[PDB]
Protein backbone atom coordinates (compact mmCIF):
# COMPACT_ATOMS: atom_id res chain seq x y z
CA UNK A 1 0.00 0.00 0.00
CA UNK A 2 0.83 3.71 0.10
CA UNK A 3 0.08 6.84 2.09
CA UNK A 4 -3.47 8.07 1.52
CA UNK A 5 -2.49 11.70 2.18
CA UNK A 6 0.13 12.11 -0.55
CA UNK A 7 -2.17 10.11 -2.87
CA UNK A 8 -5.66 11.07 -1.68
CA UNK A 9 -8.95 9.53 -2.71
CA UNK A 10 -12.48 10.65 -1.82
CA UNK A 11 -14.72 8.04 -0.15
CA UNK A 12 -16.28 5.56 -2.55
CA UNK A 13 -20.08 5.65 -2.78
CA UNK A 14 -21.35 2.76 -4.77
CA UNK A 15 -25.13 2.37 -5.15
CA UNK A 16 -26.90 -0.74 -3.99
CA UNK A 17 -28.06 -3.09 -6.78
CA UNK A 18 -31.73 -2.34 -7.47
CA UNK A 19 -32.80 -4.79 -10.20
CA UNK A 20 -36.01 -3.83 -11.97
CA UNK A 21 -36.13 -6.71 -14.46
CA UNK A 22 -36.64 -10.42 -13.87
CA UNK A 23 -33.78 -11.38 -16.19
CA UNK A 24 -30.63 -12.43 -14.31
CA UNK A 25 -27.64 -10.39 -15.40
CA UNK A 26 -24.57 -12.42 -16.45
CA UNK A 27 -22.25 -10.08 -14.52
CA UNK A 28 -23.19 -11.49 -11.11
CA UNK A 29 -22.68 -15.07 -12.30
CA UNK A 30 -19.35 -14.14 -13.89
CA UNK A 31 -18.36 -12.33 -10.68
CA UNK A 32 -19.11 -15.47 -8.66
CA UNK A 33 -17.20 -17.55 -11.22
CA UNK A 34 -14.27 -15.13 -11.00
CA UNK A 35 -14.35 -15.33 -7.20
CA UNK A 36 -14.38 -19.14 -7.22
CA UNK A 37 -12.21 -20.08 -10.18
CA UNK A 38 -9.72 -17.19 -10.18
CA UNK A 39 -9.64 -15.14 -6.99
CA UNK A 40 -9.42 -18.00 -4.47
CA UNK A 41 -6.49 -19.86 -6.17
CA UNK A 42 -4.61 -16.56 -6.60
CA UNK A 43 -5.30 -15.77 -2.94
CA UNK A 44 -4.06 -19.20 -1.81
CA UNK A 45 -0.85 -18.91 -3.86
CA UNK A 46 -0.25 -15.42 -2.44
CA UNK A 47 -0.86 -16.66 1.11
CA UNK A 48 1.73 -19.39 0.50
CA UNK A 49 4.28 -16.87 -0.81
CA UNK A 50 3.46 -14.49 2.06
CA UNK A 51 4.13 -17.25 4.61
CA UNK A 52 7.44 -17.89 2.87
CA UNK A 53 8.21 -14.16 3.19
CA UNK A 54 7.27 -14.16 6.87
CA UNK A 55 9.69 -17.04 7.52
CA UNK A 56 12.63 -14.72 6.67
CA UNK A 57 11.89 -11.04 7.32
CA UNK A 58 14.51 -8.40 6.55
CA UNK A 59 14.47 -4.68 5.95
CA UNK A 60 15.59 -1.93 3.63
CA UNK A 61 15.86 1.76 4.37
CA UNK A 62 15.10 5.11 2.80
CA UNK A 63 18.38 7.00 2.57
CA UNK A 64 18.48 10.23 4.57
CA UNK A 65 20.78 12.94 3.26
CA UNK A 66 21.57 15.58 5.83
CA UNK A 67 21.56 19.19 4.69
CA UNK A 68 24.98 20.48 3.62
CA UNK A 69 25.59 24.22 2.98
CA UNK A 70 24.06 25.44 -0.27
CA UNK A 71 25.72 27.35 -3.10
CA UNK A 72 25.09 30.80 -1.60
CA UNK A 73 27.44 30.20 1.34
CA UNK A 74 30.17 28.55 -0.73
CA UNK A 75 33.15 30.71 -1.60
CA UNK A 76 33.74 31.27 -5.28
CA UNK A 77 35.79 28.51 -7.00
CA UNK A 78 35.91 26.49 -3.74
CA UNK A 79 35.24 23.06 -5.25
CA UNK A 80 35.03 21.14 -1.97
CA UNK A 81 32.11 23.16 -0.64
CA UNK A 82 30.41 23.89 -3.95
CA UNK A 83 30.65 20.23 -4.96
CA UNK A 84 28.52 19.30 -1.95
CA UNK A 85 26.20 22.23 -2.64
CA UNK A 86 25.86 21.09 -6.26
CA UNK A 87 25.08 17.50 -5.23
CA UNK A 88 22.47 18.77 -2.76
CA UNK A 89 20.96 20.94 -5.48
CA UNK A 90 20.81 18.02 -7.93
CA UNK A 91 19.08 15.83 -5.35
CA UNK A 92 16.58 18.58 -4.55
CA UNK A 93 15.94 19.11 -8.26
CA UNK A 94 15.28 15.39 -8.76
CA UNK A 95 12.91 15.42 -5.76
CA UNK A 96 11.09 18.52 -7.08
CA UNK A 97 10.68 16.65 -10.37
CA UNK A 98 9.02 13.82 -8.48
CA UNK A 99 6.80 16.28 -6.55
CA UNK A 100 5.51 17.64 -9.87
CA UNK A 101 4.96 14.02 -10.94
CA UNK A 102 2.92 13.30 -7.76
CA UNK A 103 0.69 16.32 -8.35
CA UNK A 104 0.20 15.37 -12.02
CA UNK A 105 -0.81 11.87 -10.93
CA UNK A 106 -3.37 13.43 -8.57
CA UNK A 107 -4.72 15.61 -11.40
CA UNK A 108 -5.07 12.69 -13.82
CA UNK A 109 -6.61 10.41 -11.19
CA UNK A 110 -9.17 13.11 -10.39
CA UNK A 111 -10.00 13.56 -14.07
CA UNK A 112 -10.67 9.84 -14.53
CA UNK A 113 -12.39 9.44 -11.17
CA UNK A 114 -14.83 12.35 -11.34
CA UNK A 115 -15.71 11.45 -14.90
CA UNK A 116 -18.09 13.61 -16.85
CA UNK A 117 -18.27 16.19 -14.04
CA UNK A 118 -14.47 16.37 -13.84
CA UNK A 119 -14.25 20.09 -14.62
CA UNK A 120 -16.14 21.25 -11.53
CA UNK A 121 -14.96 18.56 -9.12
CA UNK A 122 -11.20 18.80 -9.77
CA UNK A 123 -10.62 22.51 -9.18
CA UNK A 124 -8.47 21.89 -6.10
CA UNK A 125 -6.14 19.48 -7.90
CA UNK A 126 -5.96 21.89 -10.84
CA UNK A 127 -5.09 24.74 -8.49
CA UNK A 128 -2.38 22.70 -6.74
CA UNK A 129 -1.06 21.69 -10.17
CA UNK A 130 -0.92 25.32 -11.30
CA UNK A 131 0.88 26.41 -8.11
CA UNK A 132 3.47 23.63 -8.21
CA UNK A 133 4.12 24.09 -11.95
CA UNK A 134 4.60 27.84 -11.44
CA UNK A 135 7.04 27.12 -8.59
CA UNK A 136 8.92 24.49 -10.62
CA UNK A 137 9.06 26.83 -13.62
CA UNK A 138 10.38 29.76 -11.59
CA UNK A 139 12.92 27.48 -9.99
CA UNK A 140 14.29 25.39 -12.86
CA UNK A 141 13.08 26.39 -16.32
CA UNK A 142 15.43 27.72 -19.04
CA UNK A 143 18.59 26.64 -17.20
CA UNK A 144 19.76 24.48 -20.10
CA UNK A 145 21.37 21.09 -20.41
CA UNK A 146 24.38 22.34 -18.40
CA UNK A 147 22.32 23.43 -15.37
CA UNK A 148 23.90 23.87 -11.96
CA UNK A 149 23.20 25.52 -8.64
CA UNK A 150 25.06 28.57 -9.99
CA UNK A 151 22.71 28.89 -12.99
CA UNK A 152 19.72 28.49 -10.67
CA UNK A 153 21.08 31.11 -8.26
CA UNK A 154 21.71 33.53 -11.12
CA UNK A 155 18.16 32.97 -12.37
CA UNK A 156 16.76 33.57 -8.88
CA UNK A 157 18.82 36.75 -8.45
CA UNK A 158 17.61 38.05 -11.82
CA UNK A 159 14.00 37.31 -10.81
CA UNK A 160 14.50 38.98 -7.42
CA UNK A 161 15.98 42.07 -9.07
CA UNK A 162 12.96 42.22 -11.37
CA UNK A 163 10.59 41.85 -8.40
CA UNK A 164 12.48 44.50 -6.41
CA UNK A 165 12.38 46.92 -9.35
CA UNK A 166 8.65 46.27 -9.83
CA UNK A 167 8.04 46.87 -6.12
CA UNK A 168 10.11 50.07 -6.19
CA UNK A 169 8.41 51.53 -9.28
CA UNK A 170 4.95 50.79 -7.82
CA UNK A 171 5.57 52.88 -4.69
Amino acid sequence: SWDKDVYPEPPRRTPAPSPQTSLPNPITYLTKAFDLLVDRPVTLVREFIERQHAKNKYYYYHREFRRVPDITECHEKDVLCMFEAEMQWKRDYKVDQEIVNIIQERLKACQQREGESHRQNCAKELQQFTQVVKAYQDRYHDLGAHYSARKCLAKQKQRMLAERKATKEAA
Partner: protein
Protein backbone atom coordinates in the same frame (compact mmCIF):
# COMPACT_ATOMS: atom_id res chain seq x y z
CA UNK B 1 -11.84 17.20 -85.69
CA UNK B 2 -10.25 15.27 -82.78
CA UNK B 3 -8.24 16.95 -80.00
CA UNK B 4 -4.56 16.55 -80.83
CA UNK B 5 -2.50 14.80 -78.17
CA UNK B 6 -0.19 17.26 -76.46
CA UNK B 7 2.81 15.37 -75.02
CA UNK B 8 4.44 16.49 -71.80
CA UNK B 9 7.59 15.62 -69.87
CA UNK B 10 5.71 13.17 -67.64
CA UNK B 11 3.18 12.03 -70.28
CA UNK B 12 5.05 11.12 -73.46
CA UNK B 13 3.69 10.76 -76.98
CA UNK B 14 2.25 7.33 -77.86
CA UNK B 15 4.05 5.11 -80.33
CA UNK B 16 0.94 4.91 -82.51
CA UNK B 17 0.59 8.72 -82.71
CA UNK B 18 4.23 9.42 -83.56
CA UNK B 19 4.76 10.46 -87.21
CA UNK B 20 8.23 8.87 -87.37
CA UNK B 21 6.76 5.44 -86.54
CA UNK B 22 5.44 5.19 -90.12
CA UNK B 23 8.77 5.86 -91.84
CA UNK B 24 9.33 3.18 -94.48
CA UNK B 25 12.57 4.70 -95.78
CA UNK B 26 15.62 2.53 -96.30
CA UNK B 27 17.85 4.49 -93.92
CA UNK B 28 15.39 3.91 -91.08
CA UNK B 29 15.32 0.22 -92.00
CA UNK B 30 19.12 0.18 -91.83
CA UNK B 31 19.05 1.94 -88.44
CA UNK B 32 16.43 -0.47 -87.08
CA UNK B 33 18.32 -3.49 -88.42
CA UNK B 34 21.60 -2.21 -86.96
CA UNK B 35 19.93 -1.70 -83.57
CA UNK B 36 18.52 -5.23 -83.84
CA UNK B 37 22.03 -6.48 -84.67
CA UNK B 38 23.57 -4.76 -81.63
CA UNK B 39 20.79 -6.07 -79.39
CA UNK B 40 21.13 -9.60 -80.81
CA UNK B 41 24.89 -9.56 -80.29
CA UNK B 42 24.49 -8.41 -76.68
CA UNK B 43 21.71 -10.98 -76.22
CA UNK B 44 23.90 -13.82 -77.50
CA UNK B 45 26.86 -12.63 -75.42
CA UNK B 46 24.63 -12.58 -72.33
CA UNK B 47 22.93 -15.92 -72.78
CA UNK B 48 26.11 -17.81 -73.67
CA UNK B 49 27.25 -16.92 -70.16
CA UNK B 50 23.82 -17.26 -68.56
CA UNK B 51 23.29 -20.80 -69.87
CA UNK B 52 26.81 -22.03 -69.04
CA UNK B 53 26.70 -24.99 -66.60
CA UNK B 54 30.21 -24.35 -65.29
CA UNK B 55 29.44 -20.72 -64.44
CA UNK B 56 28.52 -20.04 -60.83
CA UNK B 57 28.44 -16.40 -59.86
CA UNK B 58 27.37 -13.04 -61.26
CA UNK B 59 27.32 -12.38 -64.99
CA UNK B 60 28.91 -8.95 -64.78
CA UNK B 61 27.26 -6.31 -66.89
CA UNK B 62 29.72 -3.62 -67.99
CA UNK B 63 26.72 -1.39 -68.73
CA UNK B 64 25.69 -1.52 -65.06
CA UNK B 65 29.27 -0.93 -63.87
CA UNK B 66 29.54 1.87 -66.42
CA UNK B 67 26.33 3.46 -65.11
CA UNK B 68 27.40 3.27 -61.46
CA UNK B 69 30.81 4.70 -62.33
CA UNK B 70 29.24 7.57 -64.27
CA UNK B 71 26.86 8.38 -61.42
CA UNK B 72 29.62 8.72 -58.81
CA UNK B 73 33.27 8.85 -59.89
CA UNK B 74 33.20 10.55 -63.29
CA UNK B 75 31.32 13.65 -62.13
CA UNK B 76 34.14 15.81 -60.72
CA UNK B 77 36.62 15.02 -63.58
CA UNK B 78 33.90 16.39 -65.89
CA UNK B 79 32.94 19.40 -63.77
CA UNK B 80 33.90 22.85 -65.03
CA UNK B 81 33.11 25.92 -62.89
CA UNK B 82 31.26 28.28 -65.23
CA UNK B 83 28.26 30.61 -65.01
CA UNK B 84 25.66 27.82 -64.95
CA UNK B 85 27.30 25.62 -62.30
CA UNK B 86 28.16 28.58 -60.08
CA UNK B 87 24.69 30.13 -60.27
CA UNK B 88 23.08 26.75 -59.62
CA UNK B 89 25.52 25.79 -56.87
CA UNK B 90 24.90 29.05 -55.02
CA UNK B 91 21.13 29.11 -55.53
CA UNK B 92 20.57 25.55 -54.30
CA UNK B 93 23.52 25.40 -51.91
CA UNK B 94 23.46 28.55 -49.78
CA UNK B 95 20.04 29.91 -50.80
CA UNK B 96 18.00 27.60 -48.53
CA UNK B 97 20.53 28.14 -45.73
CA UNK B 98 19.94 31.91 -45.86
CA UNK B 99 16.18 31.30 -46.13
CA UNK B 100 15.87 29.00 -43.12
CA UNK B 101 18.32 31.18 -41.19
CA UNK B 102 16.08 34.22 -41.55
CA UNK B 103 12.92 32.19 -40.85
CA UNK B 104 14.23 30.62 -37.63
CA UNK B 105 16.01 33.81 -36.56
CA UNK B 106 12.89 35.95 -37.02
CA UNK B 107 10.77 33.36 -35.19
CA UNK B 108 13.14 33.11 -32.24
CA UNK B 109 13.64 36.88 -31.99
CA UNK B 110 9.85 37.35 -31.95
CA UNK B 111 9.40 34.57 -29.38
CA UNK B 112 12.24 35.83 -27.17
CA UNK B 113 10.76 39.33 -27.24
CA UNK B 114 7.34 37.94 -26.28
CA UNK B 115 8.83 35.94 -23.39
CA UNK B 116 10.89 38.79 -21.98
CA UNK B 117 7.88 41.11 -22.29
CA UNK B 118 5.75 38.55 -20.43
CA UNK B 119 3.37 38.00 -23.35
CA UNK B 120 4.00 34.41 -24.45
CA UNK B 121 1.75 31.98 -22.59
CA UNK B 122 4.28 29.70 -20.91
CA UNK B 123 2.01 28.61 -18.08
CA UNK B 124 2.50 24.84 -17.95
CA UNK B 125 5.74 24.77 -19.97
CA UNK B 126 8.30 23.09 -17.72
CA UNK B 127 9.64 20.45 -20.13
CA UNK B 128 12.11 21.76 -22.70
Amino acid sequence: SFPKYEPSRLASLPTTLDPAEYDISSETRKAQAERLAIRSRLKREYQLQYNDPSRRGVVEDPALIRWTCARSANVYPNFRPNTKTSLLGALFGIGPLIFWYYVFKTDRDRKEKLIQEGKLDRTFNISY
